[PDB]
Write a structure and sequence with these properties.
The structure is cut from a larger assembly and holds 3 copies of chain A.
Chain A: E1 4-9, H1 17-21, E2 31-35, E3 42-47, H2 56-68, E4 75-78, H3 90-105, E5 119-122, H4 127-148, H5 156-170, E6 173-177, H6 179-183, H7 188-194, E7 202-208, E8 214-219, E9 221-225, H8 239-254, E10 259-269, E11 281-283, E12 289-291, H9 298-311, E13 317-322, H10 327-332, E14 336-340, H11 344-357, E15 360-363, E16 381-382, H12 390-399, E17 408-412, E18 418-419, E19 430-431, H13 436-448
Parallel strand pairs in A: 1-3, 1-4, 4-5, 8-10, 8-13, 9-10, 12-16, 13-17, 14-15
Antiparallel strand pairs in A: 2-3, 6-7, 7-10, 11-12, 14-17, 18-19
Bound molecules: chloride ion (3 copies).
Residues 166-169, 193, 263 of chain C line the site of one chloride ion (CL).
Binding site for Mn(2+) 1 (chains A, B): 220, 225, 237, 298
Pfam family, one (chains A, B): Peptidase_M17_N
Domain Peptidase M17 leucyl aminopeptidase N-terminal (chains A, B): 10-114
Chain lengths: 449, 449, 318
Amino acid sequence: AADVVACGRHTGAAVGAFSRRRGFVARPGQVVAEPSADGRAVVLNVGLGPAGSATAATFRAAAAASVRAVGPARTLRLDLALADGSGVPAAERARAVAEGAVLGLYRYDEYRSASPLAEVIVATPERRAVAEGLAAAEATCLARDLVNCPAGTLTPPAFADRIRELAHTAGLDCAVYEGAGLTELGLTGLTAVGRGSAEPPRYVELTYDPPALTVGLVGKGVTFDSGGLSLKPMKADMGGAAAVVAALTALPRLGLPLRVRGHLPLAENMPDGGALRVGDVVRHLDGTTTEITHTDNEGRVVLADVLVRASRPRSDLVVDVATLTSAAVHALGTRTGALFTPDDRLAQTVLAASERAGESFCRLPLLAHERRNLRSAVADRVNCSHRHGDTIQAALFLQDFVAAGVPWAHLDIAAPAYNDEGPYAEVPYGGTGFAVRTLIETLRALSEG
Amino acid sequence: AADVVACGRHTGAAVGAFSRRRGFVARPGQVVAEPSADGRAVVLNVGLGPAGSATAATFRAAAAASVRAVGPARTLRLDLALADGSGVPAAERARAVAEGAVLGLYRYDEYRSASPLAEVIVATPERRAVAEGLAAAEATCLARDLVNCPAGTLTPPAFADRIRELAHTAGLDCAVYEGAGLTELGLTGLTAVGRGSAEPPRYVELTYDPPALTVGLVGKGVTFDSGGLSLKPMKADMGGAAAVVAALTALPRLGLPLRVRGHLPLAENMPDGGALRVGDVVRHLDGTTTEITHTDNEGRVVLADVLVRASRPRSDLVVDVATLTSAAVHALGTRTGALFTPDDRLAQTVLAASERAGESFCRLPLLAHERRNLRSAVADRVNCSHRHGDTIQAALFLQDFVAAGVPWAHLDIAAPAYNDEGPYAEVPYGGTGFAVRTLIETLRALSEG
Amino acid sequence: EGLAAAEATCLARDLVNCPAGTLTPPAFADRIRELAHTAGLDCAVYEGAGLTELGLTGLTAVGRGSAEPPRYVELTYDPPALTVGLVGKGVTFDSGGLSLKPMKADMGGAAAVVAALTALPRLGLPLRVRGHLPLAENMPDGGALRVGDVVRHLDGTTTEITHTDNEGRVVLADVLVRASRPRSDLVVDVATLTSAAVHALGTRTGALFTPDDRLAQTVLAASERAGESFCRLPLLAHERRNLRSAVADRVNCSHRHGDTIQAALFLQDFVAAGVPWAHLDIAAPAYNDEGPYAEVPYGGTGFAVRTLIETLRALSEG
Ligand SMILES: [Cl-]
Ligand SMILES: [Cl-]
Ligand SMILES: [Cl-]
């Protein structure tokens, strides 16, 4: 038997006298606990708001609120997806409730010294949708764990080792490049940025090959970013690599008819007697040059050569994900990512995917007039203009390295990848796993078309 | 009938199965609501922790937690003070529960556009203690209201008007000095600091004369402090005046055999074409001079002449209360006030009073070697050394103005007067009314001896 | 008695004044060994693999960025029925690490402890005293301690490094575990620990923390005899909330006001249950960067040497 049962209630739905006396008015995520009818167990009444305004995000948030209110129970049954009357179809309700339950239960206690809850059950006939939601949420929590991991544990070599182990679990193809084998690939930005650190850099390629469409995902894996010699105005700057790895791990379970390759440059950015210097010039894999005008804009320099490699003459589409710029957050706020692409059809695909996933993105323009801020007196471009517009300038910088004719999108997720404000809804303090579920929904949509 | 009854539970005390299933373990301030035995009402089980470790502060905090958990109820009965088994005597339990209930219910909604709770009842035979606690808490909430009030509403003239109205309610004697009548008193610091503002300064004396001991209380009433021309590194810098006024309003109800006089300089510190200048010299009521080296250290300059007036050849003791220095907070933190006095017996009286009231103070030394940091090249002293130790230097500065032989204490309450972190226990966000209850307990102790 | 106390103070002044390039952690350990030999104080110096064996994780983590390796020294006066442990912070150069400061004088606590120990054979107190001295540099480097790293201490508890400039408390943690382990009747630590202290206390007064009122009075009266200024600050229970971490058992920096009190509470966690303890935070008065006055020079002052000696004298009588 369930120790606790969570009942979804839209505004106007009947609850008992005790629930009314406690102030239950079905506000989204409001929870009031009471004894079960027979007095042997617990019932949670959980608000879903007005039936007419409810979305999948309402259900996701209500499930997370339910799991947070479980107390010392061993078993919890969520009946939330059985609540009908909203416009959210049964399968969408089931998927969202399953996701919210896993996301809301997430804890990162690995590094504390010194959970009665053994089973969460989602009630619904939509078993496929439950499975899909659990898998998406489990992938999100993998990314959360990677971001939360101290940089001393998750070094570039350790991260490469972890990716290899994850790949083995579905027999994703995995190649790890290190030392002389890495030098051979000509990823000059990665090796230049990574050299100051005592930890050597790594490059990992991770392939799902279950198709007619091949998608390349590029994820920024800076495991610790101190700003280098220039300083910042630090373990979470591998959030892009975390999102890409996690999305790839979810694909074998979903069984999408789509080939997907992950490209993952891993490094630390540290000050040191041998660190990358202001004024240095990097000669990239495509023969073009970048002048290092600020060592804290290292991400774009690392990604450059990987985008050349990923788009070389073959992937039909390349998507990069990176915690790239701080300028983004000033106008967009802390919970919204930035999307760049020249392809309007790809923009709509990514944006609709983010809406299904409950993740907030804003498309920003690849402004031609900001290219003047890439100009260098010495090299082909700079990595920092010291002027306003760095979020757009970084996107334009990356665009230079994507081979002619290859559709491309760039996701700048610096702010929403790490929550330094309190927990809310299904999102914890700290590493969030932001963009995992957007990526999965994007890949699902691309596989259909 | 009570809609809600709050039951105090020490660790190990019996609660029903539902309460156990919800995780009730009697942690201090933990609340679990359940149906009453007959199913017609609500019971709150409220944690009081181990009987052996419980203090009056435990009861105060539990009462505040209870009132926050009332929901939409019209009537609440707190049975918390009936819980025995701790070392806290019945009268102390009753006083603390009454205080915590009022303090925990506090809201400041005067300036919002657009409470079903009509009665809170404290169950106990200790009716005198309940009355004492309600009165102390009501005085605290008066101070909270004054601090929370926007500076545009609570100007120096408006504040003087409010004090006059409060005084009238018990026929405390009240004299308000303004314009030419104020100029006659020779409070040079007050008039110099206040001149930049469009609002004119005020000085108010408020006397409780129901005795053989006469106590003077001096409260800093800067209703808005911009830092003046020097700037800060702002409505809450009248927290000292608020505490003094509120303590005085509580005395007629308590009926202490003690004469108490309040001395309240009120002003704004603003930049302006006619504002106090760096390098200006103030000639005080005692003939000594102060050089203005920083216009943001205006509080000590305002208080100086009032301390001369208050201690002049008569008050047996003078206590000043002021939100004086920011340096305090760096080592003491945001919830602890600083106490200065040369009189060890007075220090113990104030500290024991603060312990009874549940307010945190630390005695700091009047360090003779910090007097060298008061030296000026032009006047008798400076108002700012630009060196470390300003909290101690400010206390030494004030000490200069207290007439020879008069016992004196100074309370620097800058940090705990305003809570800019979240609410906790019986303390809200914003104006706290800090030091009201310490002052009342100090005056009670002095009246006995 | 006065000449000996003053000579010990001047030893501490010399150690603090010494350039960090001369007084490296290995060089400091060598100097302590030589000083110990002069009265045959027992002296053990731990380095390399022998140091790793002691499990002083904070010391080895903080010290790793520097080209200079860390050292740990134990120095014992055993001439008694009372045994006192003294713990002295010996950061020979503190750059702030990767986080930066808002630098050779951050071994003033170790200097005071060493100097006090050297004075005991002359005075002949009937008291056993053990010094515990972690020595390291805090430097930025490709291999330096990172923000977000977690240190697992000798007692099994964990600390999250939220600011690399609060390295002193992290170094002291494991030494306090070792010094108070199941035996010393009392442990006193001395450290140039926090800058927040000085803001309200000024540049010539140290901060004293202890839960034991009788020990507080002993230390304060000793400081009065010695002519050194201390102020007792409270171990505020409500400041413990500022030690909370989202990842580890505690943080080394809250980024909030009250760091002097928070540092004392941090250290308190590592002192074994039931062992009386006091903490002296001497950051400001250990180095005089204002002019000379009275008996105090510009620069290294040897602050707390004479307070420690007077404290040990009082404890030896009772
Ligand atoms: Cl970048
Ligand atoms: Cl002031
Ligand atoms: Cl520290």
